[PDB]
Design a protein around this nucleic acid. Structure first.
Ligand SMILES: Cc1cc(Nc2cc(C[NH+](C)C)cc(NC(=O)c3cccc(Nc4ccnc5ccccc45)c3)c2)nc(N)n1
Length: 543
DNA sequence: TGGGACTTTTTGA
DNA sequence: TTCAAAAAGTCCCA
């Protein structure tokens, strides 16, 4: 169930400026009403609007039809439309709507118990509101997913979520000049799976306002990051979008009387976006952050993709069969040529990597089972059956004892830069011990021809600075509260520079690394050094 | 006595 | 053949 404040906000957002005199026959649709949270509020608003202008309607239109007693019949016969796939919810909503008046004649309530995606809608609607389903994300049957692919190929493709299709339907059955307002998961704004949906929305309807709650738990005891979308098909010219992005992601929804109070408060920030200038990723930032990003973009000649080679870590397919504690006695059974140092994301800090506490048995270098039978029977064979269920093992590409994705050793066994894929801040570290890692850590190394221009020390100096932390967080995807996704498709697009401040920045980075490396270390001075480096970086970027 | 925070490996391309 | 994106379940403290 949607929170009541959100429902009231959406309903008012649509119907507040409706001219009931000009069009006393509005069609308002709840595609997924459930118990009818939106439709009851729509009924109340419509009843108040009609009673407020009942005598004007009587004077202009038929004098007998427009009476206060007839408002209930008119609303239930011509105005409210609801759809659902649950018959019990439909019956409950019908009973509530009938009891809103409190049997002389028959009142036909326009309620449909059907699949909204597969229904042949007879007419479009002036207003559409509600909350599309999200409980069923990947639980669709094979036939249903095939139908979605065949009939909704423009917004739904493989990894797309169900509610994407709903968006298309809401756009398709919206009357020209009508208004739609829904609360949905916010993931389609930034996820690569929703590029088709974003383009479909941008090229058809005018978006008016986006409420981005980010990681705030809008739905109690439900872990979905929600957003509110309002749009119209009116003949606007400029079509600027109000954006209300939350600031404090730990606020409580119930602690406010209305959503307007929360939006106008300091817990939210507002800025305008030109819809014509939207990219595919829908970067939504204020003017100051936009100027910061543009300055950094124009100042930097190179990007990480231009001067570096990036790769994902080892994917064994069964970590228990190949990862052991360095203290484990079974490592005495494995030749040290097959053992590689193994690190996790927690082992990666700024500028350096913690000492590896684990060893990976790089079984791809085991040639035959006869010579190393002890390794294959006493260590790796413990999970042989599970290792046999891997896709490449079943297809015959990889042997049962080999790593599913062992990548290339020579990529890992070199001086490189490693970073976690999900972190609250920029943590880029120079690896000095040829560490191997799982997919939770990404790595990259400088290209050979750019080694004279860029050094690992300078790269980790600029990347770990607060300047580049802000620069990356501007465009980075926020997967959860206080957690950003650090993936190559975003990390490698970071732009880097080099100028007269290069040598001093590199020296400061070297000092920080040297302090962090020694045993008798106090963090201390490092912070001071960092501050100085940041100054230079700002001096280099004109910020 | 509830209540959400995290890392391994599946899989499309 | 192999990359990399994203999907996917258990568990402990006040
Ligand atoms: C908070 C808390 C907690 C606990 N515990 C535990 C914990 C953990 C970790 N850390 C510490 C937190 C874990 C556990 N398990 C299991 O199985 C595991 C293991 C490993 C890994 C994993 N991963 C996964 C899976 C699936 N899916 C997903 C999704 C997203 C992400 C991730 C993921 C899991 C338990 N307890 C309480 N009380 N609380």
């Amino acid at each position: 169930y949607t929170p009541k404040i959100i429902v009231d906000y959406i309903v008012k957002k649509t119907l507040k400026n409706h001219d009931i005199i000009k069009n006393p026959y509005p069609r308002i649709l709840d595609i997924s009403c459930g118990c009818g949270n939106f439709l009851l509020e729509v009924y109340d608003i419509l009843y108040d609007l009609f009673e407020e202008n009942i005598y004007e309607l009587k004077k202009k239109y038929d004098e007998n039809y427009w009476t206060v007693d007839n408002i209930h019949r008119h609303i239930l016969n011509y105005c409210i439309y609801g759809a659902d796939i649950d018959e019990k919810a439909i019956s409950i909503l019908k009973d509530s709507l009938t009891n809103k008046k409190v049997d002389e004649s028959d009142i036909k309530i326009n309620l449909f118990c059907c699949d909204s995606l597969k229904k042949k809608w007879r007419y479009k609607f002036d207003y559409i509101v509600g909350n599309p389903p999200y409980i069923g994300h990947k639980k669709l049957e094979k036939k249903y997913k095939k139908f979605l692919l065949e009939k909704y190929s423009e917004v739904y493709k493989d990894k797309a979520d169900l509610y994407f299709c709903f968006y298309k339907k809401i756009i398709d059955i919206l009357k020209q000049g009508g208004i739609g307002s829904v609360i949905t998961p916010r993931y389609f704004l930034e996820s690569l799976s929703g590029k088709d949906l974003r383009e479909y929305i941008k090229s058809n309807v005018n978006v008016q306002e986006i409420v981005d709650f980010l990681g705030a738990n809008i739905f109690k005891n439900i872990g979905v990051s929600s957003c509110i979308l309002t749009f119209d098909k009116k003949k606007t010219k400029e079509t600027y979008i109000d954006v209300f992005k939350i600031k404090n992601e730990d606020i409580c929804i119930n602690k406010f009387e209305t959503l307007e109070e929360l939006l106008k408060s300091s817990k939210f920030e507002h800025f305008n976006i030109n819809q014509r200038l939207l990219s595919d990723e829908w970067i939504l930032v204020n003017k100051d952050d936009e100027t910061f990003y543009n300055k950094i973009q124009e100042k930097c000649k190179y990007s990480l993709e231009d001067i570096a080679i990036s790769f994902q870590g080892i994917i064994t397919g069964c970590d228990k069969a190949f990862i052991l504690s360095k203290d484990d006695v079974k490592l005495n059974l494995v030749d040290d040529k097959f053992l590689k140092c193994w690190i996790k994301s927690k082992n990666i800090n700024k500028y350096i990597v913690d000492k590896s506490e684990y060893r990976l048995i790089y079984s791809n270098d085991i040639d035959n089972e006869n010579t190393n039978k002890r390794i294959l029977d006493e260590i790796i064979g413990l999970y042989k059956t599970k290792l046999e269920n891997r896709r490449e093992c079943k297809s015959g590409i990889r042997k049962w004892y080999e790593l599913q994705w062992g990548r290339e050793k020579l990529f890992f066994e070199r001086k490189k830069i490693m970073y976690p894929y999900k972190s609250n801040e920029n943590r880029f570290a120079i690896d000095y011990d040829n560490n191997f890692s799982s997919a939770d850590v990404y790595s990259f190394f400088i290209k050979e021809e750019y080694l004279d221009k860029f050094s690992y020390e300078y790269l980790v100096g600029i990347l770990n600075s607060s300047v580049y932390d802000k620069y990356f967080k501007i465009t980075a995807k926020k997967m959860s509260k206080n957690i950003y996704d650090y993936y190559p498709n975003k990390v490698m697009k970071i732009r880097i520079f080099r100028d007269n401040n290069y040598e001093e920045i590199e020296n400061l980075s070297k000092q920080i690394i040297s302090i962090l490396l020694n045993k008798s270390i106090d963090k201390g001075k490092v912070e001071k050094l960092q501050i100085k480096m940041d100054n230079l970086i700002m001096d280099s970027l004109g910020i």
